[model samples]
Target: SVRIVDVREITKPISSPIRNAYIDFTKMTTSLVAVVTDVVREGKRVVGYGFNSNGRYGQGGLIRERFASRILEADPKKLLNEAGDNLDPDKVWAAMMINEKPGGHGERSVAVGTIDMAVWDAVAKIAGKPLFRLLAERHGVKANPRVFVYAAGGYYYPGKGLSMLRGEMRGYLDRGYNVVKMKIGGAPIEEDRMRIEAVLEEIGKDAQLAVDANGRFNLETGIAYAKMLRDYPLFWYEEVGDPLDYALQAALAEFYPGPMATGENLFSHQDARNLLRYGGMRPDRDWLQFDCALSYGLCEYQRTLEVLKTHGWSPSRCIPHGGHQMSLNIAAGLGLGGNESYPDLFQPYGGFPDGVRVENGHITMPDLPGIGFEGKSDLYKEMKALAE
Candidate 1:
């Protein structure tokens, strides 16, 4: 039977000087996890690796104090699948969540999600298939590896102006990206308009632009910016208000004629349900930005997907927020709209496997077992250091 022998975690620095609308990434950290098993591949012990997305801090505290112990202390047989050959990620997710009460879906979710990602990696390795293929086969869906992606850069820098912003965006388009994203709400409305216009002129008909407020606006500011933004054809206006302010989000839809996206901050299925029930997000046009690495991993994300289906939303509406590979696997395996990509930020952790290049806003998933972390040399080096 496939059993988890060890789970190790470390807090790594992915700190950047870039600033968004709400916060700076100077102290951004990620929790890296390794789930080691007895299962061997090519005469080597198979180990599953996982890490949290950016914008959230590392979860080493909770991983070391609670979630990891729960898995190590659980009966090995209980963590196995129905067929008993491989570990069931759902069952393993349940084990990590044990003794934890409902609600309070904050940093703990990140902690469980970090380990859960590792668990899925190990499960996929044990089955000798890419995580995307395993996920597609298990869900009875045909796997589509070619996914739509957008370059997520253009953060506000201390000395960056319209020229710098335009140059940065041009870099992405030159790299074969079809859609590029930038941050808003960090500057005045007029200044941001100039910045937007400069980028529009820069890209000119070559690629599209998506602007993220990063939940920096309130009701009036959101609608005001929506009015200003409607004049331009944008890919999507994202996270314009406080993430929990369903009322604020619902009200902005009336003023904005273009597509909108949010839900990166709502961490649970219930919150997602409430957003659909109260927030006026149009599934026909708008997109969902839920990241599994932040919202309690793929297990809870599956629950959130069910909630989306129940509300008449297709999985194609989802284009998760993180630029990590876990969402890439999910997007390919389950037919999401697309996955986010940090073309110039969050190094070693936010990119595709080595030699996988983004062409026309999409990067095809390489054939690698267990989330393809091993295919990424620098990231795999970190994972190997933890496992060894």
Candidate 2:
């Protein structure tokens, strides 16, 4: 049986000198974790790694105090599945969640999720396959190595004007990205409109644009932006109102006759179900952005996907929030529509394997075992340091 012999966690600063619509990334951080196993592969000890999503701060306190300790303290045999060939991520997830009651998920979810990611990474490594391939076999789905990805930059920066914004988007198109996303609601309506028009003009027929309000608006403002946004042939309008404001989200469909997306801030399957039931998100055109790393990692993400399937929402509608490799692997393995990408933001933590490149908006996955962090040099350096 593959035994989890050690669990380690660390907090790292991925701080950036940039700002989105609602927050600045100057002090942003992420929690990185390593799950070391008694099993060895090739010539090295098998290790799985994980980190929390961007936007949410690092979960070091909870990870060191509760989640990681729970896994290390548990009966190693119980953490394995019936076959004993691989570690059961579900059991590890449950161990981290023990004594935790329902509701009030908050940062605890992030903490557990950080460890859960590491668990899955280790599981796949023990199985001697990429995490996506392992996930596909488990779920009875065909893994698609070529998954769609959109360039997500265009944050508001000090003294950045329409010219800079246009140039930023143009750079993505030049790099073969077909879809690009930018921030909105950070400026006056007129100024935002001008920025949108400038970017639209810059990309012309070469690409599609999606806008994010970052939950900055109320019902009135959401509708107002929806009406104005509906006239353009944009990709989607995102997170216009507070993430929990189901009524406001539902109302948006009345004014905007195009695709809309949200749920990046929602942390659990229950909240995801609430959005589906009352948030007025149309499965046909709307997208769901429930990022696993932020919520509760792949174990809970599988539950959320089950919820979506039961509700008749296609998994293709999900393009998770974090622009990280873990989500990219999940998307490819589980038949998700696509994953998000940060072409020029959240370096080392927000991109693909070193040699992978976006071709016509899609990237082909490498055949690295686990989540493939080792294939990304700079990211692997940090992960290696934690395990060593």
Candidate 3:
């Protein structure tokens, strides 16, 4: 039986000076969790790791107080599948979610998501395969090792002029990225347009651009930006209004004929369903950014995919928000549109394994076991230290 021997969590600060339209990441932190099992692989004890996505703070209190304890206290036999060859992530997720009520899914999602990530990691490692491959085999899908990725940068910085912005965007293009994203709504609409024009001028058809509002605009301002943005051939306009305001999203379709993406903040399958039902997103053009790490990890992410299928939405329409390797694995294994990447932000936690370079707007995953964190030396160092 695959028994969980111990569960541990540590909070690390990934704070940055970068600011978007809605919030600054100056005090942002993430929770790093370790789930240790009795199984051994390659002469070492098997251990799984997890961490929450950016934007949300660390979940130390909740992890230590509730979710982690729930898993540790549950019967080890109950957390395994009928075959008992490997741990069942679904059972582990249910064990952690016991007694938790429906809805009001704020930080609790982060807590459970953290553990759920670790559980899947453990499961994959036990099978001696990468998580993406395991997921593909389990779901009966052909895994595409090469997944599309976009360089997500362009934040509201202090004293960052248009020249600096152009230089920054140019750097991503130089790094072989064909798609990049930027921040808007922090300045006046005209100024934002100028900044967009500056980047467009710098890239000059070398790459495409995506703009994120971070839910800073109201209905009128969103439509206003949409009207102005309709002139350019942008990659997508993202998170124009509040995530729950389905009406606002529904209304934007009448104004912006191009691609629009949101749902990074809608932390549940139910919320994702509501967005699909009432959000008026055009499946033919628009995109979904329901990140698994932020919402409820891969378990709930599977449910979100089911919801998309029920609504006749393709898994290819999903381009998750967080740039973590977990989403990258899912994108490769299960066929998401792409995964987001921060070329220069959210160090150690937001990038691919070392030496996995982005070429032509896509990256090939490293053939490493589990979620492949071990392939990322710097990130694995941090994760290893937490458990040791």
Candidate 4:
């Protein structure tokens, strides 16, 4: 059996001089993990890499002190699948959460999630297939490498204004994006309306826009924004209120007759369950943005998908939040509505493989083994450094 020889993690800053309603990116960090194995391919040691998405802090501390040791100390055979030739991400995920209790699925969820991503990458590489194709083959479905993606940027930057914002959106449109997102709730209601209108006028018939408040509004403010936003033709109003406040989400539907998107802040399947059960989200129009990198990786994400199915929600309604490639693989493999992208933010980490271009709001997934990290040269440089 191929054994995991070592596990390593490093904290890297994706820091940017921008802020949303809830937080700033100047101090943001992400955890990158490399899962080393005994197998070698093409005369090089096989190493699988993974990282948590932006927004959540780096989880290297939890990974080093808790999760990584669990994988290294556990019997290697048990972590393998029934075939005993490759790693089973499910079993490895189970081992990560062995002694942990339920509820309070926050920082540690991101930690475990980062490692689980590496495990899956390793599993796919060992099987010698793109993660998407492997997933489709396992599920008895044909893989769709073509995936819809929307440009996610427009943060509140220091010393920046409407002109810069217009230029940014125009650049994305120039690059063939058909949808874009902007940050709201940092300015006053009237000021934000002007920002939205300015972007709409700038994009004007070229592409649609989505606005995110990052869970910074109360009931009164949320409904007020909803009332104002109902006049625009937005792709979606995202995270209008607190993520856990289902009532606030449900109530916005009455005031805003447009589609709403949330679930990025939700960290578990049960949290998604509560959001759907009480959150007045119309699956017919609303989009769920549960980012797997923040919610215990794909293992838990699959469980969340099951919850959506049980609740009559279609997988097509899901458009995960993180712009990372892991969610892109999930979208293509599982048939999600689309994946998010950061054309002008989170460089070297929040983008597609090199030479892959976005055209008409979509990018065809390249056939690269193990989540395609190696196809992105800069990211792979960092991952390779840790594995070495």
lDDT of 3 by residue, 29-105 (tens): 99999999999999999999989889989999999889889988998988888889789999999898889888897
Clashes (backbone N, CA, C under 3 Å), per candidate, total 0, 0, 0, 0
Clashing pairs in 1: none
The TM-score of candidate 2 is 0.98
Estimate, for each residue in 1-388, the C-alpha lDDT of model 4 and write its tens digit.
6788999989998897889999998899998899999988778878889999899989988999898998899998898888788888898898889889889989998998888888889999999999998988887888899999999888899988999999999999999999999999999999899999989999999899999999999999998888889899999999999999999999888898889999999989999999999998998999999989889999999999999999999999999988989998888898888999998777787699999999999999999997999999987888888885
Residues 1-388 of candidate 2: C-alpha lDDT, one tens digit per residue: 6788888888888887778678988999988889999898888899899888889899899988887888889988898899988788888888888898889868988888878888999999999999999999998989999999999989888888888998999999987899999999988887889989999999999899999999999998888888888889999999999999999898888889899999999999999999988998889988999989988889999999999988999999999999988899999999899989888776778698998898999999999999999999998998999994
Each prediction's TM-score versus the true structure? 0.98, 0.98, 0.99, 0.99
For model 1, the run of ten residues with the poorest summed lDDT? 342-351
RMSD of 4: 0.9
**TM-score of model 4 relative to the true fold?**
0.99
Give Cα-based local distance difference scores for all models: 0.90, 0.90, 0.92, 0.91
TM-score of candidate 1 versus the correct structure, residues matched by position: 0.98
